[PDB]
Amino acid sequence: KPPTRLFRGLNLSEEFTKGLIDQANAMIANTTERLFTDHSPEAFKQIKLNDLSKMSGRTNASTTTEIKLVKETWDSNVIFEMLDPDGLLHSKQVGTESEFSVYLPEDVALVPVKVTLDGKTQKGENRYVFTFVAVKSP
Predict the structure, then answer these.
(1) CA dihedral 19, 20, 25, 31 (to 10 degrees)
(2) Cα 63 to Cα 1: distance, rounded to the nearest angstrom
(3) Mind giving me the DSSP string for the chain?
(4) What distance in Å separates the CA atoms of residue 82 and residue 8, rounded to the nearest whole number?
(5) Residues 105, 60, 107, CA angle at the centre, nearest 5°?
(6) Do the bridges between strand 92-93 and strand 99-102 make them parallel or antiparallel, or are there none, so unpaired?
(7) Where is the binding site for NAD(+), in residues?
(8) How do beta strands 126-136 and 78-83 pair?
């Protein structure tokens, strides 16, 4: 019974973060609609191609169930929140008891659903949470 919510953080440049927000919101408003309603295989692949969270193909990406660890250890300005109700991520605990190793299969997409401002880093940067749901190929 793996965890269904996992966080991963990255420190990204000011300009890249702005471009990432626009890409995320663009996808949320265009592509994800076609996937959630029509279960469009075209929409699925386009979402996979974008790979917003830089996780595609990874077999042991580090994550944690506690967003606070991410903030305290790395002070990331961009945090990726993955909602995985179906256990599609093969979450493995790396006993640091909240740390889990994740594998994203090629037939699983991290579908963006929300971008939310979540305070600031110690550096005064806006911190953004990108929320995804892990979905199987239609």
Answers:
(1) 110
(2) 16
(3) ---SEEEEEE---HHHHHHHHHHHHHHHHTHHHHHHHH--HHHHHHHHHH-TTS-TT-SSEEEES-HHHHHHHT--SEEEEEE-TT-TT--EE---TTEEEE---TTEEEEEEEEEEEEE-TTS-EEEEEEEEEEE--
(4) 8
(5) 5
(6) antiparallel
(7) 8-14, 99
(8) parallel
- Solved using: X-ray
Contacts of residue 99, defined as CB under 8 A and 6 or more positions apart, other chains included, come to 62, 63, 64, 69, 93
Residues annotated within the binding site are: 8-14, 99
**Contact assessment for residue 129 and residue 32, using Cβ atoms and an 8 Å cutoff:** no
In contact, 10 and 80? CB cutoff 8 Å:
yes
Residue of 92, 65, 91, 53 whose CA lies nearest to 5:
65
- Output the CA torsion 110→116→121→126 (10° steps): 120
Strand partners, 80: 8, 130
Resolution (A): 2.1
Question: Helix crossing, 31-38 with 41-50: angle to 10°?
Answer: 140
